[PDB]
Amino acid sequence: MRFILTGVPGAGKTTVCNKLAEKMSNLSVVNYGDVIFEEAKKLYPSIIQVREDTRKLPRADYRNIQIEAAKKIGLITDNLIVDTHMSLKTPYGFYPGLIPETINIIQPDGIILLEFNPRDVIARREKDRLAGDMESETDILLHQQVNRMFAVSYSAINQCYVKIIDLTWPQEYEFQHTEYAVNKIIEMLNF
Amino acid sequence: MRFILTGVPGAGKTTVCNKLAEKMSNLSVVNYGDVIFEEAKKLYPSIIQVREDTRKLPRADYRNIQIEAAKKIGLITDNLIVDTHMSLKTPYGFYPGLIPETINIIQPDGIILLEFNPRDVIARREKDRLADMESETDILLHQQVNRMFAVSYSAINQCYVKIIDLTWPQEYEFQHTEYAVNKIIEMLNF
Amino acid sequence: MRFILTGVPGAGKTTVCNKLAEKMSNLSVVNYGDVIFEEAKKLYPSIIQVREDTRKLPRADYRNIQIEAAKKIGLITDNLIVDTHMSLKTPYGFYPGLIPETINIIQPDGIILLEFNPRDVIARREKDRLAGMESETDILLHQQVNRMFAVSYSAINQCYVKIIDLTWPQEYEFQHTEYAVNKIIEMLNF
Ligand SMILES: [Cl-]
Ligand SMILES: [Cl-]
């Protein structure tokens, strides 16, 4: 099965993706931004050295590279988990990480939204910052509801599932959010 | 005029449909799930005996059946009211009840959402059971999701979105149903 | 750059536009409705005299005029700010202000939503009425729907969505308008 996994940045989605790769066999865990970076270096070796360079390209070339990455993802395997972002916040507002072509190509069975509590997100982002912009509770609640609207739109267009995993409850022990999300996702795949 | 009527399950949408079919003339009402069941028995008698059997079909066959059902619905009359669901909850998440083909075929003038209070929905669902047990948060989510789905379908197909508020407390039983029927009629005979 | 500016009616969206047109160089601010009205009197003088007369035209004629106006707007300038409405309320429900052709023609970089507090909007509308009546909940709904419409357009046409918050209390009159103008300018000169 194929699921696009998303959440607000730095909340622990990458932790879940890396931890999913160990526990599931014949499951592909892949980060969309990374494939975009690789194909951008391949097609524009001259310009692209750091992964921030994808910002600078012309939007037509960047969209072409997004399509190429969607193709590379499209044939990988049977079980896929695509780690990307419904939307990223910029000075000009929110911008979608996916283009319609990406979904048409990957043909995902579903979209998964990891919804955390804003306090946990702030504390986790500061924890990771200390280990190596500071948004407010309201900024993050917004970001999450907007991710929700984006996924529902993508579902209405491509007829795929919308699965909202709740991780807003208080942690009884550190890393319980990650474990619960991993277990729900696994439970979901092997149904 | 043509309106797709939706709400969360077991909330009283079917009652409103029955009462509209009674009070309204020159308007024919239909249940999408029932037509899907009929065409599934028609095209696949081997498998389809109960209306839950549609689950077992390959998704390609089920989509073909939805297409055929939409064709008959679109032809059925001039004024329509189609009882369907914006989205249904499954172990894999929410899934839209409509596919784009259904809307392109029926070309509804609008979509109508009956939005209830979760407490009313819980009490009504248990009342009907006596004649899964979701929580207030589950139901608020489901309805907000119905909202997003309807607005998306509107942006794509350039159609109306009418949200009927029934979250206020009932002064007498069956006032929600009455108010909804009256608003829908008022809207139709404009 | 091209931004479609939206908000609920009579909340001060037009004031933000007028003050921006005053403050920004090489910036043209234009109202979609006004171009629609002008081309409607030009092309259909018989029916169109007051700007409400746009109501009476056939929806085909109204759409053709919308296309002609969107053509004119995209043609009209370099730096643009288009004053419109994500959605308008009608007896049949909410209906979107933009058509797909409008966006394809204008190719806006983004959408901007001025989101107010319902009390501020109501009080501002009564202020404007007295100078020459929805409920708080009606307006919260209208705005959540505006939001959903903008997000849908965003997914379909890959444009920005900027939500400017004006629901805090005004410490002095015209602070909402001033803050919005400043945020938008800061955004433009990035
Ligand atoms: Cl019902
Ligand atoms: Cl205004």
Residue numbers in the entry:
A (entry chain B): 1 to 132, 138 to 196
B (entry chain C): 1 to 131, 138 to 196
C (entry chain A): 1 to 132, 139 to 196
What is written in the article reporting this PDB entry?
In addition to the well-characterized ATP- and AMP-binding domains (ATPlid and AMPbd, respectively), the enzyme has three functional loop segments including the p-loop, the selectivity loop, and the catalytic loop.
A notable and distinct feature between the native and Ap5A-bound forms is present in the AMPbd, where the last three residues Ile73, Ser74, and Leu75 in the α-helix spanning residues Arg59–Leu75 change to a flexible conformation when bound to Ap5A. To test whether further destabilization of the helical nature of the segment, by itself, can drive closing of the AMPbd and modulate the activity of OdinAK, we substituted Ser74 for a glycine residue. In comparison to the native OdinAK structure, there are only minor structural differences near the Ser to Gly substitution. A glycine at position 74 seems to preserve the overall conformation of the S74-helix and does not initiate the unfolding and translational event that is observed in the open-to-closed trajectory in native OdinAK. Collectively, the results suggest that there is a network of interactions driving the conformational dynamics underlying catalysis in OdinAK and that the loss of one hydrogen bond to Arg2, as well as the destabilizing energetic contribution of an internal glycine (approximately 4 kJ mol–1 ), is not sufficient to drive the conformational change of the S74-helix during subdomain closure. Hence, the local unfolding reaction in OdinAK, although necessary for the closing of the AMPbd, cannot be provoked by the replacement of Ser74 with a helix-breaking glycine residue.
